[PDB]
Amino acid sequence: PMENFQKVEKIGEGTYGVVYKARNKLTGEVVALKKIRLDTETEGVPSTAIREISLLKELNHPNIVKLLDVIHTENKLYLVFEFLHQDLKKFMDASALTGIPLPLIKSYLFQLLQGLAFCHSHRVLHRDLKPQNLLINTEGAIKLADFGLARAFGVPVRTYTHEVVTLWYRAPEILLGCKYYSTAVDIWSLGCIFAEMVTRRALFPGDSEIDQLFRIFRTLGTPDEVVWPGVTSMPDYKPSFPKWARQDFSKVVPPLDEDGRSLLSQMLHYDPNKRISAKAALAHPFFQDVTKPVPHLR
Amino acid sequence: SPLPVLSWANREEVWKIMLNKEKTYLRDQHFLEQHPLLQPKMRAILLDWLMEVCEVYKLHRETFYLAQDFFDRYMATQENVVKTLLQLIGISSLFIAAKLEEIYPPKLHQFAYVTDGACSGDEILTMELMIMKALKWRLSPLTIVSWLNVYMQVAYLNDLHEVLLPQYPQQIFIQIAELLDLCVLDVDCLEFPYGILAASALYHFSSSELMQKVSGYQWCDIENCVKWMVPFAMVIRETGSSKLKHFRGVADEDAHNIQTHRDSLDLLDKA
Numbered sequence A: 001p002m003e004n005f006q007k008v009e010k011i012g013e014g015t016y017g018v019v020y021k022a023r024n025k026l027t028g029e030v031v032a033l034k035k036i037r038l039d040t041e042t043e044g045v046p047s048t049a050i051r052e053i054s055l056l057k058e059l060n061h062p063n064i065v066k067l068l069d070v071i072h073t074e075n076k077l078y079l080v081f082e083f084l085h086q087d088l089k090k091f092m093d094a095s096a097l098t099g100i101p102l103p104l105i106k107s108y109l110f111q112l113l114q115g116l117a118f119c120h121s122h123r124v125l126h127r128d129l130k131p132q133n134l135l136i137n138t139e140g141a142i143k144l145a146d147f148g149l150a151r152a153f154g155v156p157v158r159t160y161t162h163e164v165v166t167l168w169y170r171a172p173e174i175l176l177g178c179k180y181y182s183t184a185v186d187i188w189s190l191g192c193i194f195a196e197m198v199t200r201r202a203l204f205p206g207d208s209e210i211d212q213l214f215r216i217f218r219t220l221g222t223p224d225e226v227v228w229p230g231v232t233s234m235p236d237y238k239p240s241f242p243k244w245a246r247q248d249f250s251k252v253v254p255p256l257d258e259d260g261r262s263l264l265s266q267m268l269h270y271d272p273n274k275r276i277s278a279k280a281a282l283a284h285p286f287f288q289d290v291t292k293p294v295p296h297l298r
Numbered sequence B: 001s002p003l004p005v006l007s008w009a010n011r012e013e014v015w016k017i018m019l020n021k022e023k024t025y026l027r028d029q030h031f032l033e034q035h036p037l038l039q040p041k042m043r044a045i046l047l048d049w050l051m052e053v054c055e056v057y058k059l060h061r062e063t064f065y066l067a068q069d070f071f072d073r074y075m076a077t078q079e080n081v082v083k084t085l086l087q088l089i090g091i092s093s094l095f096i097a098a099k100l101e102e103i104y105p106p107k108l109h110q111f112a113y114v115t116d117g118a119c120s121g122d123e124i125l126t127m128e129l130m131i132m133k134a135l136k137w138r139l140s141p142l143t144i145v146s147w148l149n150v151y152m153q154v155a156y157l158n159d160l161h162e163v164l165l166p167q168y169p170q171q172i173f174i175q176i177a178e179l180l181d182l183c184v185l186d187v188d189c190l191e192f193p194y195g196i197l198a199a200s201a202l203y204h205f206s207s208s209e210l211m212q213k214v215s216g217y218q219w220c221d222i223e224n225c226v227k228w229m230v231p232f233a234m235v236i237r238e239t240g241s242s243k244l245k246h247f248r249g250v251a252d253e254d255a256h257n258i259q260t261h262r263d264s265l266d267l268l269d270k271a
């Protein structure tokens, strides 16, 4: 059963479940252990645990926190994950005076886009991208974590759960009540995380669905049928929304060159149809120093 | 690769991963010889049963086909199962499926209720863990019906080649799904990759030309499947095609995705 696993500290409890740092004291091999009390589980293995395990099995990538094993013991399900020492909110908090150096910001974003581009090419939406879910290690790596709210999408997509993404990282099309959604909600979240890395502050700290929308509008401008076709026909769109003007990106992300401000604005395009892809973001000039030559044929 | 160029990814890479997936998901038309106490017709009766319970509880076709694919993949891992615990293995498969696929699934007790007390809630919870442990927690297959959803979108494309917002007619989908549903009840179907079964079923309702545009597969690829499917095809045409229902509380843009049952009893036997 639980053989060579010594619990070393509770890392947390908070929707993801109960998670401990553990040592393989034979090996000095450090894992994250997620504990699921089956006994107290009316509906058996939770739907969110079945989805996260199957998804992560088939999502092996360097920028995705690996599922190593799934051990069933004593009416306990244990999920054993690769272990990373810190999450990106704590890092960003610890770095709020000094700043994160722009080399590390570019690197961290680049890596996140590579993870996200892996998920999307594998037809998986993360749907809960926030700094609490981005884990860093001691070698300059960042990785996607918590696939409990993630979902496989069909090439022809279908209407998915509507209660998705924590409020500050939530895309305007979800707040306005869009029927369908896909890859662009994840890209709005990374866009929000990018500015946050730059400013040392949440980009859009809303305290309600409507206050989130208004904070989005106050910074990017009240949208219309020109910038975002269909917006005025959307269920939660109200002709009364106030009229604010987009703001110069040199003052909402002051630290950021031409290329950064380009990338972020395309990451924050109102129209889900136009919002840049993860793959295309990796090919942005902002990264021109990190990305290098490839060819193509027909 | 019948996908047009994608914004989000390499249309070729997307399609390869999906083809690559089909390969890492094995199936065996001859798994019931591992269980020599068991008759091929037993499986049909069971899958016919799941489809029933899927319609009542207004579960998605994707939910039904996940159950089917959990059933046939699980048995291939096992040995010398008896008819006794086929109801338990199937309803437990549907339980896992329903939890994976529906926004608001049924509750555990409904899955025991239907069993007429031949299965307990806590037998179901035991089996679900053995099934999931046995399949090595690989519960993300491309179902037979999922390929039909792919093909139908590709068939209905315009200028800005959006493969993601679903644009196609519900009644054509219903009619091909009917032919695939009947085809699954017979273990010989597991000879044919799920991609091919769906492609082959569309062909019977259309042409080798449309099939190639939407699937990629060349006439030779589906040739044998098409031949095998012939009898199931003609039997569905002898009777006429069924009509798209509206479902209570199920919207209308979603009404084709709801699983359905007609008396597919004798229909399979003509073959």
Ligand SMILES: O=C1NCCCNC(=O)c2cccc(n2)Nc2cc([nH]n2)[C@H]2CC[C@H](C2)O1
Residues within 6 Å of the ligand: A011, A012, A016, A019, A032, A033, A034, A065, A081, A082, A083, A084, A085, A086, A087, A132, A133, A135, A145, A146, A147
């Ligand atoms: O589901 C989640 N949620 C991520 C947020 C909760 N975890 C933390 O806040 C945190 C903080 C400091 C170190 C750390 N986690 N280490 C860790 C954790 C995991 N691997 N490594 C595994 C455990 C399940 C996956 C990933 O996380």
